[PDB]
Amino acid sequence: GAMDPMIIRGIRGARINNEIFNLGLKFQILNADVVATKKHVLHAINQAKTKKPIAKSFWMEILVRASGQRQIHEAIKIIGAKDGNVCLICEDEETFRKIYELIGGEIDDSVLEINEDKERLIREIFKIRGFGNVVERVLEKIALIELKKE
Numbered sequence: 001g002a003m004d005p006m007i008i009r010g011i012r013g014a015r016i017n018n019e020i021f022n023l024g025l026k027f028q029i030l031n032a033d034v035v036a037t038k039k040h041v042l043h044a045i046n047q048a049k050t051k052k053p054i055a056k057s058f059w060m061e062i063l064v065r066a067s068g069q070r071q072i073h074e075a076i077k078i079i080g081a082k083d084g085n086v087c088l089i090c091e092d093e094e095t096f097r098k099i100y101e102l103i104g105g106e107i108d109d110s111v112l113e114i115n116e117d118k119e120r121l122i123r124e125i126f127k128i129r130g131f132g133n134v135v136e137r138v139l140e141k142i143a144l145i146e147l148k149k150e
Contacts, residue, residue, distance in 0.1 A: 001039075001150075002039060002042055002043070002046075004038055004042060005042055005045070005046070006041075006042055006045055006089065006090065006091055007088070007089075007090045007091065007092075007093060007096050008038040008041045008042060008087065008088065008089055008112065009087075009088045009090075009096060009107060009109065009112075010032050010035075010085075010087060010088075010107065010108055010109045010110065010111040010112040011032070011085075011086060011087075011088055011100070011103065011105040011106065011107055011108070012032075012084065012085045012086075012105055012106055012108045012111060013084060013104070013105035013106050014083065014084065014085075014086045014088075014100075014103035014104065014105030015083040015084075015103060015104060015105070016029065016081045016082060016083045016086060016103060017102055017103070019102045020099050020102045020103060023098055023099075025092075025095045025098060025099075026059065026090070026091045026092070026095060027059065027088070027089060027090045027091075027095055027096075027099050028059035028060075028062050028063060028089040029081035029086055029087065029088060029089065029099070029103075030062075030063050030066065030079050030080060030081060030086075030087045030089065031079045031080060031081065031082055031085075031086065031087065032085045032086050032087040032111045032112060033082075033085055033111075033118070033121065034078070034079045034118075034121065034122060034125050034126070035066075035079075035087050035111070035112055035118070036114050036118070036122060036134050036135045036137075036138045036139075037112055037113060037114055037135045038112050039135050039139065040066060040135065040138055040139065041062070041066060041087060041089055041112075043065075043066075043139055043142075043143065043150075044062045044063070044065035044066035044142070045062050045089065046150065047061075047062075047065035047142075047143070047146050048061040048062050048065060050146075050148075050150075051146060051147070053069065054071065055071070055072060056072050059089070060072050062089060063075045063076065063079060063080060065142060065146065066079060066138075066142060067079050067125070067126065067142070068126060068127075068141055068142045068145070069142070069145055069146065078125050079125065084105075085111050086103070086105075087111075087112065088100070088103075114133075114134050114135055118134065119134050122134055122138065126138055126141060126142070127141075128140075128141045
C-alpha cells in the first residue's frame with residue numbers, strides 16, 4: 001500500500017496568504033475539512049505520478065484527483081485551500097517549515113485521521129454511496145476511474 005511517501009500534515013488556525021506561493025517551492029495546500037486521511041492525499045499525489053489527464057501542473061493535478069478527477073478551478077472551489085483548518089502537502093521538511101512560517105497555526109494531525117463530522121460532509125462534496133471506513137470508500141470512488149486503488 002503506502003508508508004506516507006510525502007509529508008502531509010494537519011494544521012488548524014493556518015491563515016492562507018498569497019506569499020506562500022511566491023517562494024516557488026514544491027507544495028500544495030487543500031481543505032482539511034473534506035480530507036479523509038493522509039492516505040487520501042498521498043494517493044492523489046501518486047495518481048498525478050502515474051496518469052497525466054489535462055491538468056496545468058503536478059501539484060495542481062493532485063487537488064483534482066482527490067475530488068474524483070476534476071479540473072483546477074472546480075477542485076479549488078470544492079476541496080481547495082482556505083484559512084483555518086487546512087491540509088499541508090510537501091516533499092521536504094524544510095519546505096513544510098517555510099510554508100508553516102507564512103500560514104501560522106497549530107499542528108493537529110487528528111483533522112487528517114477521520115471522524116463522523118468529516119464523514120457526513122465528505123459524502124456531500126465527493127458523493128459516495130458507502131458505509132464502514134471513509135478512508136477506503138473515498139479511494140474506491142476517486143481511483144475507480146484512475147484504474148487502480150494505489
